[PDB]
Amino acid sequence: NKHRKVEVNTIKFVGLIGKLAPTYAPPKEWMRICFELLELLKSTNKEIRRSANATFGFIAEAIGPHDVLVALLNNLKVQERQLRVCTAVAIGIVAKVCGPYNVLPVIMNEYTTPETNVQNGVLKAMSFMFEYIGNMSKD
RNA sequence: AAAAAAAAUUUUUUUUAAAAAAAAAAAACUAGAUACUAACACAUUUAAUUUUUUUUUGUU
């Protein structure tokens, strides 16, 4: 819907269902949302971009991490900086919620790609995921 | 008494050569070309409180 009051108040409502009732919409519906959010964090506002990243955790918990990551890592190729940083946060959030062992070999593989913007976005994603799993990190 | 199958030692010349023990670009000036970095900032902001300034001049 563009605008903002709608984007913010919706993202908080969608993420609510990800917490409370994940099992209702079928997982192909959660994937329809993960694309609509991944386009939505172009937004100029912050609280939008922040809530959009939090609801990848709620979806990754619901359906699965690997369906979601491939959606995100395909988005690091993109030029514009917010999109690469706000995907790099989400990979950090998908790591914490679903476990880093699920995320990490997929990210270490993606680092091989010869484009530079992926290679920072894979290093920035690893920064975030090491502050969100605080103590773990040792393994 | 006279007519048939197996064997060993010591001395001498050379032709199509090689090897490089490992550091380089500059700098300055002036303009142009293109990538990128900071969860950078980007719509809410406004219900106690200091820009509010004048030769004092508002009466039982």
Report if CB A84 to strand B is under 7 Å: yes
Residues near A112 by beta carbon (within 8 Å), at least 6 away in sequence: none
> b/e per residue, A35-63, with b = 16+ CB within 10 A?
eebbebbebeeeebbebbbbbbbbbbebb
Report if CB A137 to strand B is under 7 Å: no
Nearest residue (CA) to C1' of B42? A44
C-beta neighbour count of A11 within 10 angstroms: 23
Q: Are A91 and A79 spatial neighbours (Cβ–Cβ below 8 Å)? A: no
Residues near A27 by beta carbon (within 8 Å), at least 6 away in sequence: A62, A63, A64, A67
- What is the experimental resolution, given in Å to one decimal place? 3.9
Rounded Cα distance, A84 and A66, in Å: 18
Tokens 């939008």 identify what position? A48
Report if CB A79 to strand B is under 7 Å: yes
